[model samples]
Target: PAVADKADNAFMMICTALVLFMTIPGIALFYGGLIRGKNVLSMLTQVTVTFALVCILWVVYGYSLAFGEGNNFFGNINWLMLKNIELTAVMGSIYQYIHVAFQGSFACITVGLIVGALAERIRFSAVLIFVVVWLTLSYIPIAHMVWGGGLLASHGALDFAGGTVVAINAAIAGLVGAYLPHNLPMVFTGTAILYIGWFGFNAGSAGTANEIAALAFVNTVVATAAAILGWIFGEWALRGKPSLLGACSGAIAGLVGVTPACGYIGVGGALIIGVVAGLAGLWGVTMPCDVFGVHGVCGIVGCIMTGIFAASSLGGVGFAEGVTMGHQLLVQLESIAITIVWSGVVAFIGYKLADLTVGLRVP
Candidate 1:
């Protein structure tokens, strides 16, 4: 009964590598290209080091506290150091090891997202300290609640990918922690990589190579395309011409917006979400690198819209049994509120802790 399917195993393994690719070169180059030239190496170092840090933590206790069965907010330490899981264990159709690697990749990218906001602002050591505290307090609990059969999952939140867990969570932290393009070509390159890797990010969320994954894959393509046009049109209207940066940002906006709804909503719904996300992301631009703007704004928009578009009448997979559109909308709002408050508070604490220890900003 717990047999692992070869197809699923191969799929997840590829997906895990793709997600990892998003951080090493993807976020690193994206953020690096956006900051002052002097700070590029610093940005890359921060991302690379933090990526490894999160990966190690995930293998140690992060996975246990996030996935091991326990309470609504946190899992137990039963699997600390990956002890109890047998080598042949199966989670869904894939090997448990694959699941661990896949989930850990998400954690890595989430941390990578935050350093974008931290670029040239926070001290390197302080950033590391904040990441440790934030990852433990914020990321682990949120991931558990959303994907580990914890509170959000139990409440039937429809996060096909990770609108709340990764996008919004990282956006808030980045806002609490915190750009001109030093290298537009590098930024565009990073954006392309991120877009390519997102296929894995969204489709792999299904945990099986099935119809849901296919739906998510298709939705990813359409939504991103629509958002590119939406952002360009809006830019053309306001600024008189579209720029490469705007297009890249639009891509990220759509990706974030569609993340939660990729599997649940139809192509039409995905298109609508992308268009709205691109425009809203432009409006939300304030923080450096627009982490809060694109990821935060679009993530919220996507999560809430998942409620509306998820209705079968609206072409989604449909709401859970005994659930209506209004109820689901409220649930979406509640989940968003919880994520904002929880991540905001933890982020603040992390910053304060980092400040107390080694100071936060650069001189």
Candidate 2:
């Protein structure tokens, strides 16, 4: 029942495995490298547990809510837990069941972002409950609006893959993870996971083994490298020396910056984007992230730049047919706004739900 262009399926399978590496060992190592020894095990344990939870939920109900057919908002439950899916059921030429598995991994890692940083101060039970509430309510609905043919996709916003879903959403989550630890080492551990896993995060968006994928791959490499140097250079210039944490955080900023434009743009665009992303990341992390600068300036940089570089005239993907570049730019801005508002409102509700039932703050 599987059809041709299962090529998409094949691409997705590899991507899934790669993203898994991002959170587990990838993010694990990043956060591990930064955190103090005492809190290291707890952070790892929390991330590990949440990682597994998201995967399970993805299979059970997450996929259904996002991809199912439900009143144009989200998909229905006909395929709950991948149920009733014929070997042939499909979203495109690729198998529908397989596609669910692939996309679900992205969702899992996004949640992992939230879980990784909040592990220490947040109660395990509270965080677990919040992830479920937030992901199910906050994450799933937004995914539908942009990618799932909900409201935004119908209006034609170019997300390419998960510009809003993965990067922006995760960045917002990073903000909620505001409470910090005295030990900078623990934060470093999370940064590493974010860096290595990001390659797959961006490249996998291509969904093919062709030129687009190549662009994605190279762009990911160079942009990440550029962001790293940018952060280091900025540090050396401003603070007189670079730190390991700056390098790791910079890597993630570059990756996030390139996410939306990977398949659509050339390396030149990536270079500029990475440099800006790195500097922006450094500036942004000053308040929260610490090393690069603040909490999510990097993510904001990446999401917006996707709009500029994705112009077909600029070696990037042109806006969809009948859509002008200028018009598409507006759409891109709207998409970012939608993601932030939707995620913020839902996250607030999600945390409130958790607080009321299971309690939000840790004991």
Candidate 3:
């Protein structure tokens, strides 16, 4: 009992720390490398400010809206700023506030994914407005449906982590973020942070120190490895040889692809997903901006694969009783569809605002 208890606490703490890492240098560096050298500082400014802003807003009303009791559309604001919530209340076995912090960390990372790229071209004020609008419109509703006991989850959407919610949403934002930036070293630095922070991102999804966590951990390893190889091979196939950028990008493709499936799929399945994702991402990078191709494509791959691998007998802890593969697949698609449309529209609107208020082209 002591072993289990200690392990659970330790894992939770690590997960919390890792999620924090993703927001800090992890995401910051990632975005920094991808932008023009002149804009790197500006991009980093947006990440740091938004990271802190989301942290505060998440506690104030974001958590309440996403997780509090309400209709299937969204949670009520009754618990705004964690109002009237007891500090000692247990959301599960852990402190409710701890759960709040852990999940809130996710919200920060998700927004960072989008804003990171947007910072390059979009005016700061314009992107800020977009953030508020999109965060409220796109993110909360999706969170409601998938994680907050809303329609998608009711229909059996299985998001172990944020394949659909985070990766895809951010990827689409990247597509809208403008073309790739200068400095390959910046990109490499960001990739490195992503790799280190990802361990927390995947493993934390387990929510406990159990076999589920172990499975997720190993799956993370192999999927990323395979994706890295897959990406390198793709570059080699397309351009005649692999390069460092290809290798870094490939690793992310695998990581993004495996995110949703990590808690559900077999390790073998993870490798397949990673390979495809890496190849897909390589192809995706040919776009004017690779965010849509890499993050968008890889995100979809991961979200869909979760449905394929979630088993009636898979050892993961958090499935509904009597859930079938076919049923979950439909649910995952439904969530993905909703998120895509909602995010696309919101992104469009957000960008328009950015253009109108701040102007699209840089100074």
For all candidates in order, the CA lDDT equals 0.90, 0.73, 0.79
True-vs-predicted CA distance for residue 81, candidate 3, Å: 1.2
Query: Quick one: RMSD of model 2?
Result: 2.7
Candidate 2 residue-wise lDDT, 1-363, digit = tens: 435486677876777777887777766666555555677788789988888888888888888888777754567777677888777776665677667766887888788667766675677887888788888876887787877788778887666557788777766655655532445555566566566566666666666566777788898888889999998999999999998767777787788777777777778889998899889887776642342223346656666777678777787856677877677678778878877777777777666676788776668
Off by over 4 Å in 3: 1-7, 176-182, 312-322, 353-363
Write the number of the candidate with greater TM-score, choosing between 2 and 3.
3
Superposed model 1: Cα runs more than 4 Å off: none
Off by over 4 Å in 2: 5-8, 177-196, 287-295
Report how far residue 139 has shifted in candidate 2, in Å.
1.3
Each model's backbone clash number:
0, 28, 4
Residue 27 accuracy (lDDT) in model 2: 65
Query: Which pairs of residues clash in candidate 3, taking residues 3 or more apart in a chain or in different chains?
Result: 30-190, 33-186, 33-187, 60-81
lDDT of 3 by residue, 1-363 (tens): 111244666777788888888879887887677667887898889889988888888888888888887888789898888987786666655667777888888888888887776777676777677787778777777788778888777787877788877887777655655532567786788777778778878888887877777888899999999999998987888899998878888988999999988988887788888898898888777752565578788889788877776664553343567767777777788888888877788778877876788776667
Candidate with better TM-score, 1 vs 2? 1
lDDT assessment of candidate 1? 0.90
Which 10 successive residues of model 3 have the least lDDT summed?
A: 1-10
On lDDT, the candidate that comes out on top is 1
TM-score, predicted candidate 1 vs. hidden true structure: 0.98
For candidate 3, the TM-score is 0.91
Instruction: List, residue by residue over 234-346, the lDDT tens digit for candidate 1.
Output: 89998899999999999999999999999999999999999999888887873245766689899999999999999899889999999999999988898898889899999
